[PDB]
Amino acid sequence: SSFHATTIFAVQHKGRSAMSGDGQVTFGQAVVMKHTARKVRKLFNGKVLAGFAGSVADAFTLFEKFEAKLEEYNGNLKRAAVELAKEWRSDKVLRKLEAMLIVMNQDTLLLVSGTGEVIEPDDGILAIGSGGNYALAAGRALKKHAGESMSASEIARAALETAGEICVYTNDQIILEELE
Amino acid sequence: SSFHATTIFAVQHKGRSAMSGDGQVTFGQAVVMKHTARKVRKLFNGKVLAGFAGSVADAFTLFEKFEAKLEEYNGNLKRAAVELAKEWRSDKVLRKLEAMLIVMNQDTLLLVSGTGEVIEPDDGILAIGSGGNYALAAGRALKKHAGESMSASEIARAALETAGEICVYTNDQIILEELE
Amino acid sequence: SSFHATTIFAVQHKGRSAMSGDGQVTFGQAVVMKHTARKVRKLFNGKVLAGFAGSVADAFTLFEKFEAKLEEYNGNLKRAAVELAKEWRSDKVLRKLEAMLIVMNQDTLLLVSGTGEVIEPDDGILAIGSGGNYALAAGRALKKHAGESMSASEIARAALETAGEICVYTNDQIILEELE
Amino acid sequence: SSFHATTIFAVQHKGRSAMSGDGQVTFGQAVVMKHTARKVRKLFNGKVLAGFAGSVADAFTLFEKFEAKLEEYNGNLKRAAVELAKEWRSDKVLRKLEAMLIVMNQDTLLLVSGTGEVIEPDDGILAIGSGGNYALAAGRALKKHAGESMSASEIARAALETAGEICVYTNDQIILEELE
Amino acid sequence: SSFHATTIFAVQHKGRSAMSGDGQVTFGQAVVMKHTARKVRKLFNGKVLAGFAGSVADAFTLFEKFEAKLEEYNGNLKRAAVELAKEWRSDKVLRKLEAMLIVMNQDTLLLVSGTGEVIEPDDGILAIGSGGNYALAAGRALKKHAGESMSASEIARAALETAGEICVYTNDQIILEELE
Amino acid sequence: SSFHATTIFAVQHKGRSAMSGDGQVTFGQAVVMKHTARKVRKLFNGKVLAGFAGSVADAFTLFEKFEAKLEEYNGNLKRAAVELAKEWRSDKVLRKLEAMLIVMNQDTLLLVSGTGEVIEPDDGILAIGSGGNYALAAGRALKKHAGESMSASEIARAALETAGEICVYTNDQIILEELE
Amino acid sequence: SSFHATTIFAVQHKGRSAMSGDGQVTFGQAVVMKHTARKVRKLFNGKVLAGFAGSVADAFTLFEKFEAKLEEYNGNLKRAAVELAKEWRSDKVLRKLEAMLIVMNQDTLLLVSGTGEVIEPDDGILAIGSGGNYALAAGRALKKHAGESMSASEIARAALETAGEICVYTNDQIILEELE
Amino acid sequence: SSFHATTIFAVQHKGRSAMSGDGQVTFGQAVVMKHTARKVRKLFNGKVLAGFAGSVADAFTLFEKFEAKLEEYNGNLKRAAVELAKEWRSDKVLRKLEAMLIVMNQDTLLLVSGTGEVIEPDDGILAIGSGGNYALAAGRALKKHAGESMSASEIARAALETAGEICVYTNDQIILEELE
Amino acid sequence: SSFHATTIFAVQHKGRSAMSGDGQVTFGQAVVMKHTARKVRKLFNGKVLAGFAGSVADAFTLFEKFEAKLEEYNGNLKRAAVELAKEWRSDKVLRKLEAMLIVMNQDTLLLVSGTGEVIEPDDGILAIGSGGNYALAAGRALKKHAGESMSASEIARAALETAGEICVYTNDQIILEELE
Amino acid sequence: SSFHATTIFAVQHKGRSAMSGDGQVTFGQAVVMKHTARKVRKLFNGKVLAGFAGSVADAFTLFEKFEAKLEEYNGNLKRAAVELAKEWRSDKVLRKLEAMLIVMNQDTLLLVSGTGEVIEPDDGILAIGSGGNYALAAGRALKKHAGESMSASEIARAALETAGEICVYTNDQIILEELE
Amino acid sequence: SSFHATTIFAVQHKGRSAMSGDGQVTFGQAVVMKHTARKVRKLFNGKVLAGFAGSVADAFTLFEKFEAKLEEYNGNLKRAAVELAKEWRSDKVLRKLEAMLIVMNQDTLLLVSGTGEVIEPDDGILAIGSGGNYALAAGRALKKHAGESMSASEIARAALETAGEICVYTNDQIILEELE
């Protein structure tokens, strides 16, 4: 009866920062409208990666508000994040949104929700959307037991692939974006 | 207890753009009020096809808003679409609408929802309403295995016919509209 | 726990236009407050028949708004109908109303709902209210297999009688109104 | 979990007009807070009887509005009634009220609801509240088979008594009011 | 989704014993299959009246069992009743039955249920089925305020008539049976 | 999630006895597996017509049991019917069946249910299944206002056609059987 | 939809043992079939008082089983009680019974349930049925603040009266039984 | 999942007016945050006692509004009460409040609710909150069978104690306040 | 919380008989345990194709029972089918099974269910399982508008592929089996 | 589907005031996003400790409002608390918040909720959040049976540790803050 | 309200076969009874590894039955598996069991369920229990991107560790068993 949230995985590993995401539009219990979609975008002069699951409109709206808040607080992800969280909460139109937002720059990773949450993984990894948990497990596993061997981009790629292979709401049309 | 959404199929094939739709008003689990209905209309100087399932009033309201947004952004389907999506979302009166909207012009196909979704089929086909999935499967099948043989208008016609034959909420009173 | 909608049947047959309706007030699962009621009224200088099931207040309000819209668009049932539908929808107080409205003039029959629906039976018959389906079936049957033998008024009479005999929420206190 | 509606019976018989009502406050499935209550009051210079079941506040508010509407339309019960019905409906605060209102004067009896209903018993009797049906049956029975023997006041008295004896939400603390 | 229980009223008044019952088969929320039905029968050599609402099969089964138990305990209504009650309870196939049974002879009135209830009205009146409450109120009312004027048969007739006029599940096809 | 019951109409008119039925297998809210089906069969040496909606297996089982009971009681529809009803009830495997059974011979029409019901229409018509009410209304209407003009077979034909035209679960693949 | 459990209060005070109970048969949310009923009975040679709420049949069955178990264990209330509890539990027909049983003799008070409970009030008072809590509070209150002034029989009388005055399912037709 | 309403008991007896209340904060099905609480306060120059169960904030708000309304209508409890009831109702923020309010002065006792109820016990006693019924029964019992022996303050004390001993949501930390 | 039924498509086209099926084990809302599975098997000496969705055990049990029934009735698919249906029904262990069975030989196609259904598509195509409807629409479409161009095996292949592409519970690990 | 509230324990013991809290972010029935979190903060010039469970945004908002209210009423925890409670209530955006707030200074402990509650533990201990009850029990236990041996900080530490070991929503990443 | 299933992971990698499992008993939404548990056991002369989540009793029963079936079919995992599946299904006492069973020997891995499922991962990995999906993702990830580097035992260890770190129902008390 509703569209399923895309799966987005974000990891920071060895100075590199990558963020992957699948592209599968699923409306209803099992109907697939399309595949190759793009909710992982670059913001603040390609200085930050932002991923929002589901709703291109809501994605846009949020990207913009964060983009703005980013300038208002001079690229300080932390502040921009908490401020966006405050608005998120009081918007009472977006407050409703179940989907969550991931923002990260060269220094830190952050998870933001409409409930006013702003979480920073002490793990260096974040994932959200249908099948985010699967990706999270895969990512955490690969980073801990094969980090020195694979890069952030590679991990992000693998994490999503693993999720797509297990979750019926995640496919192989992966989109990767990274900050140098 | 409510009226069933009509079935609308839209396909772009070999430079041609057709959009079909059945006409069956079904109120309640199985009552049929009438047949031959028309929710597939031409907008922006017959330059775009817009189909909205169910509610002639809501259909009108939405057609108009998109018509307007279309001019405000100079016939740019993409922008007009996402803007409409934003309003759709915040209208909180239309936001409620379960039905979805399909808009397409000579270049691209788009699906818009009150949840703020704006999806573009990488497949060239979209379908919505009671029995949209059946139409979608038929359309995709015919286009992939008989495209070079049948046109967009012909496919749109067949897709709907197939849906009407399987879905108890879809009939044979098909309405076809196309952009040259 | 609520009042049951009266049953109204409207038919156009052989140049004549008749509209019947029972009169039974049923509050709750089975309590009958009274019988002989009147929700089938003549509007626009006896040039149109309007029937609204349940709520004399809501009936009045709607009759008036259509009466008005009728003049604003110079007796054009079609336009007046769709405009009334638009208001119906946005009233968000009447929007709630489950009952539906039937309007017809010397030329055409129309069904209007608070969800913004405006349906025109390609069959020449419409029916609404508790037991409308029974009336609809009886009407359609009589018109198709005994039309040349019985008039529109006669059919409307029979359709309602048949519904009253089957539906525990429809009685024999029938009210008939017709346009010459 | 809520207060049960008192039982009110109104009857017009042989030029006399009486209206009775029990007085039992029942909060919850079976708790009794008190008995002897009074929701049957005289309005418009003792020229009309009005009974509203449950909520002394809502009772007051409605009595007043009708009192007013009564003057605005010069004691015309019918108009005052339908107007009150229209407000009732649109108040969307009272619209919620499940309880119903009975109004009657020397000439006619009327039932008004928050759903915009205005019913006039062709029987000369109306009853509402917890156990109104029982009262209704008793009243109808006594009037039809013992009318010439007992008066309107007497019937109203008996109808309520019978309801109190059967309904666990109706007691013997009956209140009777009548118009000469 | 199920058949509605017929309405049966039994009254003992001034040495006479009458038992009436309507005849209306209602399947589902409002469908009427037929009218004139007969679930009020004479047993034990026309010495007792037994009425069971709904299911001609279950009616038969129960009439028989009581007929039997009646002989086993030599026409002692009381014992036969309680014994039937015990079986009723343990049958766990009839135990399910929602309908209730009324049995009466020249001396006393009794109500029996599948839950093992055996009630004797200290009032001289019993009623069961869709609309039994209405009949009960009417009967009690007529007997108390017009007893000396109308007989048991007459009351039984009126009580049912009153119930039929109010309950959408009770009609005027009344069946009366009485013991001299 | 389940298969929809076929629609069966049975009518006795002017010494003739006809029984029609559509053939549409609908599994789930709107999926159609096939059409032309046959649940209306002749029993007891073409002396009786039996129609059971849905489940060819259950249909068979029941037809057989009635066939048997028919012989055991020497073609006495009435007894065979009530006996079948008793078994129906206690089978507690068939007791579950929602579908109903219609049996009729040269003299009478009967409706049997797993709840132990055995109804005889004082009207001469019976209908059951998805859309049975529509058929019922149509049949009753045609018989009352066009009986002398059309036969039992013709009516049965029309009643079903009308139901198929309104009910999304009834089609035009009608099957007619009649006793001379 | 079911019969309400009568209210039974049992108290042991100053060497005396009394047990009261109201008599009100309430079927459904508010229908009263009769009053003066008797579920408080003397067992084991007037040596024990047993009260069971609702179902005269179930009452009987249980009284008997306890009577028996009482002899099998030589009037040892305690053992007979626990044994009855064990059967109660495994009967899986009575196990279903919601009503509870109270048994007391010259020495102790006991509460038994179909769930296998056997409670002995360290307070000297027990109450069960619709409105048992009210009686319990009244009893406890009177015994603690007016014991030395009123007897066990008097208290039992008062406790029930108080319950009847508050609970719509408890009346004043009190039945008192006591062991010397 | 929510805080349980404290228990408040108010009684007027022999010219004295006392109001007790327990102090037990229970959040959730069984968690106790604290005990000794105070929702029974003196208003209007210690001339009136007001008790509101649960929410110190809502308690305050309401006490103030009544305090005010009290002055606006010159200490007339009755008017102040009904006016507060009207506001209560329309506040649609407090209207939500499930808790009820008790107000009393030297002359009368009154119960007020957010549904617009204003009840005056013809009994001289009122109780509200978790376990108010228990207190009510105890109070009514003690007043009727030991009034001449114990005072209003003493009864109020006892009523609450009895409630605390039975209700798991009422304790022994009783607070008593009285008007001379 | 349960395993999703595989998707099976069976079609008879131009003397050839093919039956495809995907292989995707999905436990729970979206977990995939494996892919390449095989529930489409050859029976009765490769003379018949049988496909059962979900449960290899139940699949086996049913294949065997039909295999047996096949011999008992000398390869008569029709009889074997209906007999299997009867057992299916009465097994009351398999009767529970939601999944359905498809059986076909050189001459006809058949669908069997635990509810005792035995359907024969007058269309020459059958489909069952998660996404069977999608396959059904695709198959019907391709056979009607490209039959003469593609074979039964080819259609079966396409139908499943189309279903896999739309249904999140259907994959590309297709298994095809056909009778020469 | 939502984030679980962190667990916070606050205790005042022997002139010292400590407040601990775990740090575990759990989204959904069992997903853990991170651990080491901080919702226990120092306010009013390290003169007061404030802990709010869940939502860093809501935490901030509330801390600030209390901080402010604290100055407006000159560090009077009591007043600032009740005032905050009043706003909390009327915010109707925060009013929604299920989480609760704990505030304490050198003199007293206070619990505040969006329902307008302001509780002061007469026990000297407060606890909130997922697993607050476990912490509460542990704290109360240790303080009563080992107070003179362990300090407030130590107890707070232990209480949380105990909760973390039992509650699946509480971990060992404890945060402790105390006022000298 | 019930005990959570332990998490078991089984993997076959590079000729080695390992099976890990956590040990955490969680009763209810969040209560932990203990940790270090053992449901991963060696069977058939340490020739096979069997893991069953939750219920030591059910675990035992199943291990034994498979042990037996293993001998009856001479260590043929495949057959023993399917046979166990058949019994599993028909046990209708174990059939109820939600938990699943994993069995593996030197050659193959198998998953068995009470629904009669017998799945063989074409992937070489299987996982079940609370948090089995997390383990599954981690296992699949590690095996695909770090297989040649870590052994089956090592992977099994990591997969569980990863699951324990994310799932609130999985801990670090891991148990590993392997076949040489």
Curated annotation (Swiss-Prot), chains A, B, C, D, E, F, G, H, I, J, K:
Q: Which residues form a coiled coil?
A: none
* Mutagenesis / variant outcome for changing residue 7 to A: Complete loss of protease activity. The mutant is only found as a monomer
**Which keywords accompany this UniProt record?**
Cytoplasm, Hydrolase, Metal-binding, Protease, Serine protease, Sodium
- GO annotations under biological process? proteolysis involved in protein catabolic process
Annotated compartments = Cytoplasm
Q: Which GO terms describe its molecular function?
A: metal ion binding; serine-type peptidase activity; threonine-type endopeptidase activity
NCBIfam families documented for this protein: ATP_dep_HslV, PRK05456.1
- Quaternary assembly: A double ring-shaped homohexamer of ClpQ is capped on each side by a ring-shaped ClpY homohexamer. The assembly of the ClpQ/ClpY complex is dependent on binding of ATP.
Stated family: Belongs to the peptidase T1B family. HslV subfamily.
Its function, per the record, reads: Protease subunit of a proteasome-like degradation complex.
Q: What is this protein's record name?
A: ATP-dependent protease subunit ClpQ
